[PDB]
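Re: your question from the hallway

Yes, I did run it. Sequences:
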Amino acid sequence: ADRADILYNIRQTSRPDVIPTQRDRPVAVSVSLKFINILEVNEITNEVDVVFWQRTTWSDRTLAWDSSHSPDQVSVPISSLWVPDLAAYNAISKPEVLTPQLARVVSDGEVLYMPSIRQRFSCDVSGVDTESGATCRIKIGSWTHHSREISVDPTTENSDDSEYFSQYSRFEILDVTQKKNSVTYSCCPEAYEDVEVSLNFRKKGRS
Amino acid sequence: ADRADILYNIRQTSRPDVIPTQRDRPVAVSVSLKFINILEVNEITNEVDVVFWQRTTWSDRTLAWDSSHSPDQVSVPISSLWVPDLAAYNAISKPEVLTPQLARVVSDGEVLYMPSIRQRFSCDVSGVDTESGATCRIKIGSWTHHSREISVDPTTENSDDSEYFSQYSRFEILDVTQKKNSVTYSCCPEAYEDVEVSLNFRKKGRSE
Amino acid sequence: ADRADILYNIRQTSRPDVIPTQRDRPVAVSVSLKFINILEVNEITNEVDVVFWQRTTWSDRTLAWDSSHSPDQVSVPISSLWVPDLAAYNAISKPEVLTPQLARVVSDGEVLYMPSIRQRFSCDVSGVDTESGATCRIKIGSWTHHSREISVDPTTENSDDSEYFSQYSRFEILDVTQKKNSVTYSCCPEAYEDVEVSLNFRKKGRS
Amino acid sequence: AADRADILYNIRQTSRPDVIPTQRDRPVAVSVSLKFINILEVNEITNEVDVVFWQRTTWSDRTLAWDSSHSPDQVSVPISSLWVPDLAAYNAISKPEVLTPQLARVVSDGEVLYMPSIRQRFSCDVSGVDTESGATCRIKIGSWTHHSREISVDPTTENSDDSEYFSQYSRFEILDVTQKKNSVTYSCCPEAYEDVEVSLNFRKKGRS
Amino acid sequence: AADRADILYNIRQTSRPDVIPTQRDRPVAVSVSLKFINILEVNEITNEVDVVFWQRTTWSDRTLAWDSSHSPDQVSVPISSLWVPDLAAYNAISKPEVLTPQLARVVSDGEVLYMPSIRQRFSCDVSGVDTESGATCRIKIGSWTHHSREISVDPTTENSDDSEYFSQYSRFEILDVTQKKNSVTYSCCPEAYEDVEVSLNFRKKGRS
Ligand SMILES: CN/C(=N\[N+](=O)[O-])NCc1cnc(Cl)s1
Ligand SMILES: CN/C(=N\[N+](=O)[O-])NCc1cnc(Cl)s1
Ligand SMILES: CN/C(=N\[N+](=O)[O-])NCc1cnc(Cl)s1
Ligand SMILES: CN/C(=N\[N+](=O)[O-])NCc1cnc(Cl)s1
Ligand SMILES: CN/C(=N\[N+](=O)[O-])NCc1cnc(Cl)s1
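Structure:
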């Protein structure tokens, strides 16, 4: 087997419009943003324009193959794959995807998709010019699928919060915490899971 | 059966360009805006930029299936279903759809589609910097289907207007009231139903 | 024959890239702008930004069906139909179509398409703050089909011109005249028919 | 008698959109003539100008020819069904906003005419715009991928008025226009690339 | 023998655009080189530049080759028919605005050449732009999803020097472009993604 065959096989088995629920359990999607830049910020309107990599991780076993004597990874367009309907609940602009819309697929079915996204949010900018900084909280979860259908978690890998953050930003990152949360709506007993990324940041220059 | 089979079936039955009209009566489409944010008001131009979750419900019986031994619900792309051709009559920009464009379909035939839309309107902004606030009126209904094909009725419930409104907005919501109406034109015989949403709001933290 | 059948047959019989020309005679397209709003205006650059419903009407007899025991009108996507190739000759922006891209098809062959269009034009803005107002003239006609192939005609539909105009606009309409015309060029004899729409308007100098 | 439908279907089945209609080995003779409709948002500091123009573009594909003895002489055809020359403005700094329907005109002798109204920004000499001598903005346009052996671009010597189709309502006026032919070559590679250099000479209307 | 239409037909039959053309299990040697055309907006406070550049991209796809001994040895081909490297600018803050026809140039041996003019905004060091020694804006471009065992990027150590196609009408000027190679790795996984780093040394002209 070879890469042509892997991609060919994916076309035959993949159903992009059908959630790949193994049996009757939810598809566990691991979500994790890595902040790259903070471009525009508004102290009055409480809005921030941000650039970030949204590391996304789920499993789809229909796409699996034997990588005994063939590659165990390929890049595949997201248009050929089911992708989770993640939305940011406090975004006030369409997510601007800056990178090639290709997911990485492993022989064992586990998918990895990490687009760099510029997007504008509505969050608490208060304190941004102080030295304890502002805390902008972003809530990201499935727009249409609930607990039983999709579950969302953070990678919970504590490390360098400003590893890939631009040194040429006007701001700097103090902390980033990523917390699981089980939001529910007033219409219906239907709990939607979301990951709450708290971005603690301040403007550079101090006195 | 499974979710794969349900969607397969739905593709075969559903006709996206065919309004699923029950014999010879209008399709009942309910509409309900839930305002999330108010971004850029301009009292001079009488223009406001708004974010809202447009909760839309209707029945397409042709989508139905037996859910005894199968899931009762699935998310389906809006391109695989018929969707009401709703437009805001006083919009001055295309609706920017922020969320994934999937609808929610139940085996009983009812569709639920609630996108988060950002849009700019022309409406009465005067009074935004006052106690009583400005009242922005947004009229929404079918662009091509008249009252015999689409009837719109606002799912009105005096519960909580700012339930999902952002606390960090410059503005605060005083009141929202959704009201059914019906527009006719001196050109033509057809009447087009609509929902007027009166958004009464003002700036937070004014002098008293 | 239910709605599905009408619509099905329309898709089977429609020829989007072929003008439904009756014999030698042209296609009688009728066009009528109904001004909804005027948003931005500049007297220095002579540039207006205008919203208007472009009521467009023509006949394609191939689509006709017997509507004695059937629906007599249906809503159809304009990507399925032939559509007159209209252009605003003094436009300076691609027309932003704000409404759903659906036309109305009648069983006798008549097609009605009335999109709401926001568009930027180049025209006389001199006046505008005065009592007389300013007359912005807008020419709309076919881009590639001349008199013999496409004819344009304003629908002389007596209506006060502010019927659908926004009361919350910063400007107001004085008078709107929709005059038929026919522009011709220096390369070729080909004469192209246009509607010359005269928008006499001014700023609401309040009191 | 062949009707328009028959003419189109012939074109579709024999026109190869992604194949240059080379006649044996000789280059396809494209003709490019810009007609200027307006000049907008000028800037002498940054050296940049929005310009609207009709880009009259003519070439020929004789495989498309038919007998118009008792049938229409021309048809309008979408450009997606045709091969269209891959012209680009070399000093453009925004992608071209095509304002008009993307229909070409095919003539029964195989001749093809495409003339869109394009609104596009350029980097060029804007110095002198508020002087009587004016500024001279040069726009180079030619095939992005096909060399002289494959595509030749010719400026149409018409000798007409330069401000013929130009908007009288612009802030600026045209003094003179000259469409010269040029042969751009690159440091890396041998094969030469033809272009038309259009020198637009324009000045700000003396409002006094 | 074979015409251009025959060459193009064969390409669409052999070319699989979503499959990296790894000969053996070597990485694909994608070579990347920017050639700067303009610098339009610069902001020293926010560290953001709006640059226009040609992105000379070159690689081998041997599943495209053909016998050109009695046929043309090159063709222009739309990139949607070819596999194209998934190159991204790591510190780009806007999508790449491709200003030119999206056609690549394929040679009979399998060599593909794609040189799009692109306008794009970057987050980089603008400090000193108005000084004599200027600013140094570093742009990092490499594959987005393929690691070093799949795509290897490399600057064509071929100058070409190097304000050659840079607009003389720009507000700024180039002092030095240098294009060295790099190999970034991450904390997630042990696989290195090659990139090219283009240091643009520029400054506002002024006078002296
Ligand atoms: C830039 N950071 C990356 N990985 N990382 O672990 O941070 N890039 C590799 C990938 C990019 N897209 C997919 Cl899918 S994997
Ligand atoms: C935020 N409110 C939601 N549901 N709710 O019932 O309130 N979201 C779930 C869905 C959103 N769109 C569709 Cl369709 S289901
Ligand atoms: C909403 N206003 C309408 N007419 N009007 O005269 O105002 N609708 C009728 C139609 C609109 N578009 C098509 Cl097609 S039929
Ligand atoms: C706007 N000027 C035109 N002709 N002219 O000669 O000036 N229009 C007619 C055509 C437009 N596109 C094609 Cl093809 S023929
Ligand atoms: C403007 N520079 C060019 N080449 N160059 O090597 O400098 N143009 C020719 C090409 C443009 N796109 C392809 Cl592919 S070949």
